[PDB]
Design an enzyme around this catalytic site. Structure first.
Site, PDB file in Angstrom:
ATOM      1  CG  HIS A 129     -24.070 -75.484  27.976  1.00  0.00           C
ATOM      2  ND1 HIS A 129     -23.520 -74.359  27.395  1.00  0.00           N
ATOM      3  CD2 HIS A 129     -23.543 -76.545  27.320  1.00  0.00           C
ATOM      4  CE1 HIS A 129     -22.739 -74.731  26.393  1.00  0.00           C
ATOM      5  NE2 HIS A 129     -22.716 -76.053  26.348  1.00  0.00           N
ATOM      6  CB  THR A 135     -25.307 -77.962  19.776  1.00  0.00           C
ATOM      7  OG1 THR A 135     -25.096 -76.595  20.156  1.00  0.00           O
ATOM      8  CG2 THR A 135     -25.189 -78.853  20.984  1.00  0.00           C
ATOM      9  CG  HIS A 187     -22.324 -81.064  26.506  1.00  0.00           C
ATOM     10  ND1 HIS A 187     -23.252 -80.980  25.486  1.00  0.00           N
ATOM     11  CD2 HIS A 187     -21.708 -79.855  26.551  1.00  0.00           C
ATOM     12  CE1 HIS A 187     -23.131 -79.809  24.879  1.00  0.00           C
ATOM     13  NE2 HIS A 187     -22.217 -79.096  25.520  1.00  0.00           N
TER      14      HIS A 187
HETATM   15  N1  LIG Z   1     -21.650 -76.704  23.321  1.00  0.00           N
HETATM   16  S1  LIG Z   1     -20.872 -75.258  23.006  1.00  0.00           S
HETATM   17  O1  LIG Z   1     -19.885 -75.515  21.776  1.00  0.00           O
HETATM   18  O2  LIG Z   1     -20.176 -74.614  24.318  1.00  0.00           O
HETATM   19  C1  LIG Z   1     -22.101 -74.086  22.452  1.00  0.00           C
HETATM   20  C2  LIG Z   1     -21.980 -72.774  22.914  1.00  0.00           C
HETATM   21  C3  LIG Z   1     -22.901 -71.830  22.515  1.00  0.00           C
HETATM   22  C4  LIG Z   1     -23.933 -72.226  21.645  1.00  0.00           C
HETATM   23  O3  LIG Z   1     -24.946 -71.530  21.101  1.00  0.00           O
HETATM   24  C5  LIG Z   1     -25.665 -72.322  20.361  1.00  0.00           C
HETATM   25  N2  LIG Z   1     -26.838 -71.904  19.634  1.00  0.00           N
HETATM   26  O4  LIG Z   1     -26.905 -70.590  19.133  1.00  0.00           O
HETATM   27  N3  LIG Z   1     -25.164 -73.554  20.370  1.00  0.00           N
HETATM   28  C6  LIG Z   1     -24.066 -73.541  21.241  1.00  0.00           C
HETATM   29  C7  LIG Z   1     -23.103 -74.502  21.601  1.00  0.00           C
HETATM   30 ZN   LIG Z   2     -21.515 -77.215  25.252  1.00  0.00          ZN
END
Ligand SMILES: NS(=O)(=O)c1ccc2o/c(=N\O)[nH]c2c1
Ligand SMILES: [Zn+2]
Ligand SMILES: NS(=O)(=O)c1ccc2o/c(=N/O)[nH]c2c1
EC number: 4.2.1.1
Length: 257
Positions: free
Chosen positions: A91, A196, A93
């Site tokens: 994903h 997050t 940001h």
């Molecule tokens: N933004 S991040 O630190 O790559 C990340 C990765 C996997 C995640 O799964 C989540 N909810 O269960 N939040 C999240 C943030």
């Molecule tokens: Zn992330």
């Protein structure tokens, strides 16, 4: 509940997720002069040739491209890691303006966006178990700057119209994440957290030195997404980044001098 607004954003998260004030929170500023070159860090091993993408989802906070992680099809190994970590999703940001959007910063510089390729340590059996472990996840972070288009990103950009609002998903098979990587795999690494909620302290962060460039049109299409669901008042999905957190008792290591 939580989000990125004035009333539910990063400064509020600690009230439901007290680990927001923990000892290994992410993201952080990467002070390039303070990071220590570690000549014992191994090159990263990115093995994505058998990756199986499945679906792209607007989850109300970002969009996730999800992969089949029921076998070792797309794995990250080497670098600072022991063992094998499977790609579950990626994903991004991003910002409302080209001068902001990344989570990590480099000498306080913000990039327009940041890509997170999320991997979990196969010795823990499933992602839900892995997030409970200090070495459960490895997230490969790649900065995006605005300039020339990234051809490997366009297929992602083109499906975003079909997942405009929270809870929408679309089939997204045969996407090759190798087309999102820069040329160099030089990296910084430090122990951190999900950025997050639930903010769990389970991530070995591996942040690539070399950003990728994406076009203004590509990032503009990110900014047309919506945090809201269909039939709710439109709130553009922009500025879905957490600011840099205190480094505390951590040293960032560099694989390059
Ligand atoms: N933004 S991040 O630190 O790559 C990340 C990765 C996997 C995640 O799964 C989540 N909810 O269960 N939040 C999240 C943030
Ligand atoms: Zn992330
Ligand atoms: N960011 S948080 O601690 O999960 C948070 C902050 C403000 C909130 O207002 C809420 N009522 O809808 N939920 C909520 C969560």
């Amino acid at each position: 509940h939580w989000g990125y607004g004035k009333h539910n954003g990063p400064e509020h998260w600690h009230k439901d997720f007290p680990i927001a004030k923990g000892e290994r929170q992410s993201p952080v500023d990467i002070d390039t002069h303070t990071a220590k070159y570690d000549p014992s860090l191994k090159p990263l091993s990115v093995s994505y040739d058998q990756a199986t993408s499945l679906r792209i989802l607007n989850n109300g906070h970002a969009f996730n491209v999800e992969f089949d992680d029921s076998q070792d099809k797309a794995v990250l190994k080497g670098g600072p890691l022991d063992g094998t970590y499977r790609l579950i999703q990626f994903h991004f940001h991003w910002g409302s303006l080209d001068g902001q959007g990344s989570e990590h910063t480099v000498d306080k510089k913000k990039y327009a966006a940041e890509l997170h390729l999320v991997h979990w340590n196969t010795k823990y059996g499933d992602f839900g178990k892995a997030v409970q472990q200090p070495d459960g996840l490895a997230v490969l972070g790649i900065f995006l700057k605005v300039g020339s288009a990234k051809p490997g990103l366009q297929k992602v950009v083109d499906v975003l119209d079909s997942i405009k609002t929270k809870g929408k998903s679309a089939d997204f098979t045969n996407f090759d994440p190798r087309g999102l990587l820069p040329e160099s795999l030089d990296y910084w690494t430090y122990p951190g957290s999900l950025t997050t909620p639930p903010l769990l302290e389970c991530v070995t962060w591996i942040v690539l030195k070399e950003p990728i460039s994406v076009s203004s049109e590509q990032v503009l299409k990110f900014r047309k997404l919506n945090f809201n669901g269909e039939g709710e008042p439109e709130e553009l999905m922009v500025d879905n980044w957490r600011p840099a957190q205190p480094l505390k008792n951590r040293q960032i290591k560099a694989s390059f001098k």
